[PDB]
Assembly symmetry: C2
Homo-oligomer: 96 residues x 2
């Protein structure tokens, strides 16, 4: 209905919080994005604690578990790039 | 006061939203982190529009602006890894 197969509705509330922080006039739009950035950096690293049993074997996997933290929202990120990229001419055509 | 140099007091509200969705007992903590993942992807792709002048050049920079998304919350992510890692000897001791 509102979401097809993905958690669109829920993840949308995550961004909804960011909207409130960006409502401040003297704040940079880049401050809120970076806040979401740092927030994911903490929230997503939480799963390191379930990679291995000992911190010894866990620590060696830091780079391996993080390979799917950097890269793994990137294809979905690019999927939102085109919305502005291939539509540039359209938006460029609506500005008068 | 609630943050030193970084937007700790702000980014924590972003995670705070995740806390509400994490209140759903039948859901895994991972379905919330994944939402934050997809959410950040959409939010970061916004900056693509202010990267270049034409979509021709802009589109060719997508992977370059999408180098500093993935590979940039990286260092701040591992910064959280070490925290839990070094304190494994601590957490393992406080729990049974």
């Amino acid at each position: 209905s509102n979401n097809e197969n993905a958690f669109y509705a829920r993840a949308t509330e995550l961004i909804k919080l960011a909207n409130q922080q960006n409502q401040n006039t003297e704040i940079q739009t880049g401050e809120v994005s970076a806040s979401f950035m740092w927030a994911l950096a903490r929230y997503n690293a939480w799963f390191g604690s379930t990679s291995f049993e000992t911190k010894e074997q866990m620590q060696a996997k830091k780079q391996e578990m993080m390979d799917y933290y950097m890269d793994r929202y990137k294809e979905m990120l690019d999927a939102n790039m085109e919305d502005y990229i291939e539509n540039f001419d359209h938006y460029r055509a609506t500005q008068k």
